[PDB]
Amino acid sequence: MKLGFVGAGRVGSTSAFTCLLNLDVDEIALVDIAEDLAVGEAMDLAHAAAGIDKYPKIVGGADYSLLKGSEIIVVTAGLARKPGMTRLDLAHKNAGIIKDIAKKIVENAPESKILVVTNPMDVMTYIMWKESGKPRNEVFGMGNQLDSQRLKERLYNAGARNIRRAWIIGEHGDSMFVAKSLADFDGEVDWEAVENDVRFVAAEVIKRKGATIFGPAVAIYRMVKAVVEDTGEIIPTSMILQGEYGIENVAVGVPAKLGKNGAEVADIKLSDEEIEKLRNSAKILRERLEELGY
């Protein structure tokens, strides 16, 4: 089992750490535009590994060949702002990075699944799937899983117990929504309060701590697990839709089944009201793609 990470930044290295703690990993590859960082992260991670008596081959660098063999590759590479920048300006900057990476991944690990994390995630995962020859089963995004975790946290805070299934789907962004219909748990809540707490926790965390790190890391892990362990779990995933729920030519968050072969839309029955909301997010997402030439 080889794991690839493009981007050894905060989220890249921490999510890899997480996988190291919780997966039977043989090799870990870290590729980043900043070489010494990739390398330095690879060293630290190995020192960590020895503390749970694990000794995988962990290599970090700036050359994409390191990725050969990766069963799957987490792509966190990208930019921040200059808080005088703009969502659009960044989308362009990062879109360039994702294009460039897509090529690289195809000509080094042409058979690997790809987990897109770079924000705006739903848009970047789409640009990744388009820019690489790949089928829609080998390219998908981490997002709603993270949103969901946050959801479950506010639910337990609101008295709910035995929470199997509470999901958020749609755009990993303002346009997100809870799938009330699929929610299952003991205790009564207040979807008003909860759904709203969730749209800007991300921002509240970024305000205080600097970035969202551990939340995202775990969500990435659960998605990697599901695949490298062929668990067949269903996890809200940013998927390329090509008919499903009435939605076409965009990536957006939907219940998906993960396993060795990647992701495939679970096709779970959604409320009528919820397919509306899903179509909302797709329109928003579609527009933001056009602004970019996709």
Ligand X SMILES: NC(=O)c1ccc[n+]([C@@H]2O[C@H](COP(=O)([O-])OP(=O)([O-])OC[C@H]3O[C@@H](n4cnc5c4nc[n+]4cc[nH]c54)[C@H](O)[C@@H]3O)[C@@H](O)[C@H]2O)c1
**Residues comprising the binding site for substrate?**
81, 87, 119, 150
172 is catalytic: yes
The rounded distance, in Å, linking the Cα atoms of 260 and 211 is 31
Please give the distance of CA 284 from its chain centroid, rounded to a whole number.
19
Examine residue 46 and tell whether it contacts a copy of itself (CB under 8 A).
yes
Q: Which is nearer to a copy of itself, 163 or 292 (CB)?
A: 163
Q: Which is nearer to a copy of itself, 103 or 165 (CB)?
A: 165
Residue 52 interaction partner, one of ligand X, a copy of itself, none, beta carbon < 5-8 Å per kind: a copy of itself
Spell out the SS3 assignment of 199-259: HCHHHHHHHHHCCCCHHHHHHHHHHHHHHHCCCCCEEEEEEEEECHHHCEEEEEEEEEEEE
Chain positions 48 to 67 lying near a copy of itself, rule: CB under 8 A, are: 48-53, 55
Examine residue 77 and tell whether it contacts a copy of itself (CB under 8 A).
no
Examine residue 121 and tell whether it contacts ligand X (CB under 6 A).
yes
The rounded distance, in Å, linking the Cα atoms of 172 and 140 is 13
Catalytic residue among 172, 222, 225, 257: 172
Examine residue 76 and tell whether it contacts ligand X (CB under 6 A).
yes
Tokens of 212: 């969202």
Give 9's contacts (C-beta < 8 A, 6+ positions apart).
32, 37, 76, 77
- Which residue in the set 3, 23, 37, 123 belongs to the binding site for a copy of itself (CB under 8 A)? 37
The rounded distance, in Å, linking the Cα atoms of 294 and 96 is 12
Examine residue 18 and tell whether it contacts a copy of itself (CB under 8 A).
yes
Residues forming contacts to ligand X in the complex (CB under 6 A) are 6-12, 32-34, 37, 76-80, 97, 100-101, 117-119, 121, 142-143, 146, 172, 211-212, 216
